[PDB]
Amino acid sequence: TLGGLGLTATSSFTTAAAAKTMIGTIDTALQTATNKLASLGTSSTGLDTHLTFVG
Amino acid sequence: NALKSDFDSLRDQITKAASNAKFNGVSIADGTTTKLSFLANSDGSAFTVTAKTL
Structure with a gap:
């Protein structure tokens, strides 16, 4: 969710400098989102390997 | 006075x-x-580009 990415529901920009700050804010949000997705994929691969071992 | 009138004409044409x-x-x-x-x-x-007033 937006609160999990460092953003807020009211997050926006009204001046060009605010957009210039929002550039780096969206940078940080996209980076943390990619890290969480990679961790979820590693957990899925671990679940598949444990499934084969249980079988 | 004819040339000064033409002078003022070209002058405000610059403004336009x-x-x-x-x-x-x-x-x-x-x-x-x-x-x-x-x-x-x-x-x-x-990419700064300084304004040049004309």
């Missing part, structure tokens, strides 16, 4: 030609602003 120099409401030669920032990289680096 300078006032009309704008693109989508923004002008670099009108003198309404000191400088125009521009994108230079994906991170938002500026």
Whole structure:
């Protein structure tokens, strides 16, 4: 969710400098989102390997 | 006085030609602003271009 990415529901920009700050804010949000997705994929691969071992 | 009248005519034609120099409401030669920032990289680096008043 937006609160999990460092953003807020009211997050926006009204001046060009605010957009210039929002550039780096969206940078940080996209980076943390990619890290969480990679961790979820590693957990899925671990679940598949444990499934084969249980079988 | 004929030449001074033609002088004033070309003079305020300069004012018209300078006032009309704008693109989508923004002008670099009108003198309404000191400088125009521009994108230079994906991170938002500026490409400063100093305004030159005409």
